[PDB]
């Protein structure tokens, strides 16, 4: 199993300020063919997910622009460029290279 | 079946009516390369191929001796001396869904061009330019097979249409409505020549 | 599979004498007393026929010259087909007929038949009539054209003619329980063809399919206890050759004498 | 990163020879659809041709006997023979590479031709 | 086939709600893709396949429609949101345009 | 399905061993038996419920009737001290029994 | 795009249920799926995956020989079988698509599309 | 023939490995295979089969849907794709032949000839 950690548990961000969600990997989730097979999801509240950074460091279609994914190996980290008001809610990683697929427990960024 | 993996069957060693095609009247293309269809019925032909699938109506074209196009080109080849009769017709009450079919696939995104009856089923991440992916779906890497939108709004050019191209090659034969036998009688006869 | 067995038996040909056999019937007509004379592809009265026996079973490829003349003793189902064709490998066609006990299969393939096919046959313990055939004929079979199925053409002596004309593969066949000690019989019987496939291939060797069985294993050989039963059977050429054949009132042929066999024949 | 640059057009006498090319960075030429796409001036955009990425050709009805659309696979450069120039003619051309359902997804920057 | 943007000469305000309709005579229902020209410059997709937003396209476009009937709809305009908008035939031979809209920050 | 094997059974050198196989149905199916001596692969040493490969010698005698397959070693000596797995084929499945350990004083 | 989850209720502690999952607006014949369960308050957590055409059935532990799934290419829809329920199963469940349609694209991974989710309950 | 297997190492739980198991000599092609697998501390698993063909493949209930036998007697190998390598796979796995030629006549023959295991250890 892939048991993955994410930091920190909490990220109560006014909107406008930056902020940095980390998940770091218990093994090394990098080059099945060459890529980093981790991806980001933001659960808002009341409605289902969907993807928001895929492959570690690029994002679906239409996603807004402030968001980035870094990282490598083991250590990866979401890049929210100005936290805004339609950003509440829990993010998740997930490992996307064996076959127990294993999501984060759940990080909210919020409006304190 | 989709364009890019069409159906053939071999028919052989078997009696073949071919009154039933070409007087059917329901077909929207009825062109014959070999011996034309009212003639067909008495060519004692080898193997008879039935390739059987559903396309467009412009790319009902693609479909003849040399042509050019998504079809001819990444799909299905109808070669230059294809002997045979292509058979095409509407199937827009059957292979048309509101919302668009997408279970009808077809090759777009292929390297080079087709053989002459080639099954194009090369399913694999079609680097476009020159982007290593090493089986990514992205940019310049994306799937070659493209999906339909076959809805009863599409106009008669974009509405689905099944295609069985008849391809021809000692084993079928006729005809003449071959008249009831009569007997005791002395009588002008044709018995198989 | 292709377990081969050809090790190193190289024996000097036998010949026994067809005295007056393998006659079939030449055309598609009825006739009555009346004595006719046919042209055609038939093997010469007293002529020597390669005889083959369990000495085991070399069974090695021979030619199929024109047509071929093809007997069996073979008191238990040992001889089961053939497998006529040009290079006996891929990228030419090739005949291959089998029976198993109640239906005989026949394809024209690309097959890639071994150097020594064969099909094995069991006997389970549970049902002992059951004959569990394992084909070791060909390794890789794939894309082929015809393939007819009926019931089974096969001390019960057996007799064939094969022959291949214009794109047609034609079987004559009769079937004689005999009495003989080890050779062909003299008594004057017709072949009647079985059935005229429409192969149209181009057939220039052919071999014949053994039953064998497993009767010791020993570990790594994977030959070790193929033994041949007991059966014996013989080849004849089909050469162009006019005989008089004497029609019954029944239209069955019941005689008949070779021409230039020997002067009152003549 | 994937840019077209395209050279080749001039004032030229009607009636006459020209060509057009396009360089590729990025992009095999090759192996996909690229298409010329003509705006006269005080108009909007309008289909010239495309050659497949098999190598099929293709020109619109107010191009055929007039142009031929041509290719190297050495400079992975496109080309455009010019001939027979009327005073329609008379438009800035662009390169663009053709997907089908996807759209004209990368351009050129375009090249003035007049005729006089 | 025969595209009618309408209506051609279009103005605004910023912050309004913007609808540029490309009308399909017979029904393609798929076919369709959104091309924004800055005055007399490179023209870009917007939304291809006539839903689906083009990767990089701000989200403030979006487009509907599917069938004989399609439509852009900008939902906050901006001040350098004036352009040329094209629509285009996608899967065709002749990949029809339409003649062009300019809308006009006004 | 399965094969059940005693765990094991000893018996004195010289002496005259006997490992049982029990099954559902057993006796209709063909079961093969094989030898694991310690740090070894196995051995095929009785198949067919009745025959005896080649290089085994005639003391491995087995047979099987009704549920039970046995294995029968007269002259039991030292080297017989070894992993004994009675095996059988049922649906095309590859079923091993349990293996039973036989063991010489 | 539509991923319209059906079924799905109030279930007997040891029970029987099946989930169907009807999609349109895309292919779906090319398209790997996946099943996603979230117990209340409690976080996304996987259950299944399967190929373009089925075979390829990929199940967790919890979900051993338990649960089954399958689809129907021809009317384009997603199943899920389910025996012996047990209290941890109580969840809203999601059937999401993978991104796309190439390999190394793995079938238990990336989730583009994701649907409404309908609530299985299991008590008394 | 005489066989030799190549590939067991170490490997965490989910790993992928691909074992093999080559022949010296030709007689490869009269065999069908088997790959049995000897615990550490038991005995021995049948794993799966393949025909002298390859056409007749069969696995065991506890492993189908993860590992997949291939062979090439043209290459004289016997190799065994081993995905979803899972928490009870660690063990010495042997390939042995059968004899018989198709899955209808393995009941009269048996497994003679193995080659030297192979040691597959998963852990975390």
């Not at chain 1, 770091?24 to 097979?37: A, E, M």
């Not at chain 3, 214009?166 to 003989?180: E, Q, R, V």
């Not at chain 7, 009317?75 to 991104?99: F, H």
């Not at chain 8, 198709?102 to 003679?112: A, C, P, V």
């Amino acid at each position: 199993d892939i048991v993955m950690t994410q930091s920190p548990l909490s990220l109560p961000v006014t909107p406008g300020e930056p902020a940095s969600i980390s998940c770091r990997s218990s093994q090394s989730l990098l080059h099945s063919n060459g890529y980093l097979y981790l991806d980001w999801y933001l659960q808002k509240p009341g409605q289902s997910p969907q993807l928001l950074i895929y492959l570690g460091s690029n994002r679906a279609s239409g996603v807004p622009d402030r968001f980035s994914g870094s990282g490598s190996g083991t250590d990866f980290t979401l890049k929210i460029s100005r936290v805004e008001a339609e950003d509440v809610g829990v993010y998740y990683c997930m490992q996307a290279l064996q076959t127990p697929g294993t999501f984060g427990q759940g990080t909210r960024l919020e409006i304190k | 079946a989709s364009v890019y993996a069409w159906n053939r069957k071999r028919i052989s060693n078997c009696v073949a009516d071919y009154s039933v095609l070409y007087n059917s009247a329901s077909f929207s293309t009825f062109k014959c390369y070999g011996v034309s269809p009212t003639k067909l019925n008495d060519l004692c032909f080898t193997n008879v191929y039935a390739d059987s699938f559903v396309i467009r109506g412009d790319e009902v074209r693609q479909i003849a001796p040399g042509q050019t196009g998504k079809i001819a080109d990444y799909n299905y080849k109808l070669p230059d001396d294809f002997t045979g009769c292509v058979i095409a017709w509407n199937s827009n009450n059957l292979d048309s869904k509101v919302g668009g079919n997408y279970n009808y696939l077809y090759r777009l995104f292929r390297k080079s061009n087709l053989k002459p009856f080639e099954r194009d089923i090369s399913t694999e991440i079609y680097q476009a330019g020159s982007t290593p992916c090493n089986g990514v779906e992205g940019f310049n890497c994306y799937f070659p097979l493209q999906s339909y939108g076959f809805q009863p709004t599409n106009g008669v050019g974009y509405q689905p249409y099944r295609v069985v191209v008849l391809s021809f090659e000692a084993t079928v034969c006729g005809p003449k409505k071959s008249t009831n036998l009569v007997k005791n009688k002395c009588v002008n006869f044709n018995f198989n020549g | 599979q292709c377990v081969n067995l050809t090790t190193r038996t190289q024996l000097p040909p036998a010949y026994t004498n067809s005295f007056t056999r393998g006659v079939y019937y030449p055309d598609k007509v009825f006739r009555s007393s009346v004595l006719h004379s046919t042209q055609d592809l038939f093997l010469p009265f007293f002529s020597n026929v390669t005889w083959f026996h369990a000495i085991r079973f070399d069974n090695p490829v021979l030619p199929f010259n024109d047509g071929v003349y093809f007997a069996s003793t073979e008191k238990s189902n040992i001889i089961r087909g053939w497998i006529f064709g040009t290079t006996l490998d891929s990228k030419t066609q090739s005949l291959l007929i089998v029976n198993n006990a109640t239906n005989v299969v026949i394809k024209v393939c690309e097959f890639q038949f071994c150097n020594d096919p064969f099909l094995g046959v069991y006997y389970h313990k549970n049902n002992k009539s059951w004959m569990e055939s394992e084909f070791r004929v060909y390794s890789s079979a794939n894309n082929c054209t015809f393939e007819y199925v009926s019931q089974p053409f096969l001390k019960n002596l057996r007799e064939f003619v094969f022959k291949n004309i214009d794109g047609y593969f034609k079987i004559y066949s009769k079937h004689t329980p005999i009495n003989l000690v080890r050779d062909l019989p003299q008594g004057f019987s017709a072949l009647e063809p079985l059935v005229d496939l429409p192969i149209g291939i181009n057939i220039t060797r052919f071999q014949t399919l053994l039953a064998l069985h497993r009767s010791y294993l020993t570990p790594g050989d994977s030959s070790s206890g193929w033994t041949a039963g007991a059966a014996a059977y013989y080849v004849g050429y089909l050469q162009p050759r006019t005989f008089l054949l004497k029609y019954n009132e029944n239209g069955t042929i019941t005689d008949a004498v070779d021409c230039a066999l020997d002067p009152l024949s003549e | 990163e994937v840019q077209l640059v395209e050279s080749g057009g001039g004032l030229i006498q009607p009636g006459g020879s020209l060509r057009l090319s396009c360089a590729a960075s990025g992009i095999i030429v090759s192996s996909n659809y690229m298409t010329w796409v003509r705006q006269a001036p005080g108009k909007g955009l309008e289909w010239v041709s495309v050659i497949y990425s098999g190598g099929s050709t293709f020109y619109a009805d107010s191009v055929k006997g007039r142009f031929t659309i041509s290719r190297d696979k050495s400079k992975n450069t496109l080309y455009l023979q010019m001939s027979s120039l009327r005073a329609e003619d008379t438009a800035v051309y662009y390169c663009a590479r053709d997907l089908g359902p996807y759209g004209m997804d990368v351009w050129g920057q375009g090249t003035t031709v007049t005729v006089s | 086939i025969q595209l009618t943007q309408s209506p051609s000469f279009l103005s605004a305000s910023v912050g309004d709600r913007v609808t540029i309709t490309c009308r399909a005579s017979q029904g393609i229902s798929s076919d369709l893709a959104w091309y924004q020209q800055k005055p007399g410059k490179a023209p870009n997709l917007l939304i291809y396949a006539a839903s689906t937003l083009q990767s990089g396209v701000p989200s403030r476009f979006s487009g509907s429609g599917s069938g004989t009937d399609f439509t852009l709809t900008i939902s906050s305009l901006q001040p350098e949101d004036f352009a040329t908008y094209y629509c285009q035939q996608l899967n065709s031979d002749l990949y029809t345009f339409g003649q062009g809209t300019k809308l006009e920050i006004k | 399905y399965e094969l059940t094997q005693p765990p094991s059974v000893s018996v004195s050198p010289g002496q005259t061993a006997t490992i049982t196989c029990s099954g559902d149905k057993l006796g209709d199916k063909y079961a093969c038996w094989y030898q694991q001596r310690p740090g070894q692969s196995p051995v095929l040493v009785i198949y067919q419920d009745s025959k005896r490969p080649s290089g085994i010698p005639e003391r491995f005698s087995g047979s099987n009737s009704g549920n039970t397959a046995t294995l029968t070693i007269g002259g039991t000596q030292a080297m017989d001290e070894a992993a004994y797995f009675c095996q059988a084929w049922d649906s095309n499945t590859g079923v091993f029994g349990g293996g039973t350990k036989l063991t010489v004083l | 795009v539509q991923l319209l989850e059906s079924g799905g209720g109030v279930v007997q502690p040891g029970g029987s249920l099946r989930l169907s999952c009807a999609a349109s607006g895309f292919a779906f014949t090319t398209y790997a799926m996946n099943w996603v369960r979230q117990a209340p308050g409690r976080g996304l957590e996987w259950v299944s995956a399967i190929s373009d055409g089925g075979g390829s059935a990929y199940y967790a532990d919890s979900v051993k020989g338990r649960f089954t799934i399958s689809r129907d290419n021809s009317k384009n829809t997603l199943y899920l079988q389910m025996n012996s329920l047990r209290a941890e199963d109580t969840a809203v469940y999601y059937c999401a698509k993978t991104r796309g349609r190439g390999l190394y694209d793995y079938v238990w991974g990336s989730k583009d599309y994701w649907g409404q989710g309908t609530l299985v309950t299991v008590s008394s | 023939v005489q066989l030799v297997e190549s590939g067991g190492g170490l490997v965490k739980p989910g790993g992928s490995l691909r074992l093999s198991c080559a022949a010296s000599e030709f007689t490869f092609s009269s065999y069908s295979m088997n790959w049995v697998r000897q615990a550490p501390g038991k005995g021995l698993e049948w794993v799966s089969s393949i025909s002298s063909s390859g056409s007749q493949i069969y696995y065991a209930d506890s492993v189908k849907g993860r590992f997949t036998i291939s062979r090439d007697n043209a290459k004289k190998s016997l190799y065994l794709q081993m995905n979803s390598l899972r928490v009870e796979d660690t063990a010495v796995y042997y390939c042995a032949t059968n004899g018989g030629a198709h899955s209808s006549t393995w009941s009269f023959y048996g497994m003679d000839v193995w080659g030297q295991g192979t040691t597959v250890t998963v852990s975390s």
